[PDB]
Amino acid sequence: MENPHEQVQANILSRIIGNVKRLNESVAILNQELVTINNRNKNLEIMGAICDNYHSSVQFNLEATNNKKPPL
Amino acid sequence: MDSASKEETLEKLDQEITVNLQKIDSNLSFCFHKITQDIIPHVATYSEICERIMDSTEWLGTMFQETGLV
Amino acid sequence: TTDKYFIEQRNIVLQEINETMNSILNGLNGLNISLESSIAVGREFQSVSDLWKTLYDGLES
């Protein structure tokens, strides 16, 4: 009557569409998670920046006055 | 070439299309499993670790805020 | 003061309950996705089984 493979391809493609939709939803959720984490951690680069600035500042001061003593 | 074999070749194309579709489905399902079961939990673990970071150093944060009005 | 402490214990246990139920829902959702994938790939077997019912079925006849 009808080509046997037609229904097979129909079902296979339908399932492919379904799981690709699942993939899209999963990656969208992942993107939301990453955005949340970045916004939350936006304090950490501030922390790191001021810490690095303090380190450079104390090193420069130990250069300006010669209190920098030999290593151990 | 042959007529019986040319109908055979049409059927070959049908078989190859089916098996390629099956392989594609398997690959996409593996990708979905990798995303859902591995990548997202590790992202969540990294989130928890970074939260513990910012929690442990909050005493420095509050000092710097008290004098810098940041 | 005691009522406040009661309330804060409530909030603590409720938030941990919320996160645990989150975990439960996510696990069940993943399991359901996998199961429905199994069903989707399996549904085609009914037709071939029905075709092979013509050779041997046993109790039915």
Binding site: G18, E25 | - | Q15, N18, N22, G30, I33
Partner: peptide
Amino acid sequence: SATEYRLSIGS
């Protein structure tokens, strides 16, 4: 009637 990946988070 097909479940969709919906990771719940927070409250």
